[PDB]
Design a binder for this molecule. Sequence first.
Ligand SMILES: CC[C@@H](C)c1nccs1
Length: 157
Amino acid sequence: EEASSTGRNFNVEKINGEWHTIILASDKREKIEDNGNFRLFLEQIHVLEKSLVLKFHTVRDEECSELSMVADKTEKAGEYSVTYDGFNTFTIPKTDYDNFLMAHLINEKDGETFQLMGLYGREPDLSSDIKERFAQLCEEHGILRENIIDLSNANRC
Ligand SMILES: CC[C@@H](C)c1nccs1
């Protein structure tokens, strides 16, 4: 089907369940690198009436730890907010529900802002074609390929 979170035909309900982080991209690469606070490996989304429960794991020297966050709907169509290392708002520009999900997040902290984009899959990896589509969307947002990190071979635990 394919829909947008800000789109009218969006069914947030259909994003419920298992996901995997496939690719992260950012305006500020350090945020997603080895020691970055936003290098998060999504495991599950639980869709509630006015919020999303997000379950992640993070990696630190092959040592995994769990992290959970609750994101609230804002007043903008298809947008959610969550406090984590600053204030974040995110939307879901594209998803087909049963295979991939593309997210766009804006973080604000200490007078600075950065953008993060993520490609998530129902399976541990996605086709190279979908990965290229993601790169194209990143380009549209001013994120170059040198700032796109494929984490598929690290999205284990
Ligand atoms: C799908 C996961 C996106 C939306 C995340 N939310 C808070 C940090 S990244």
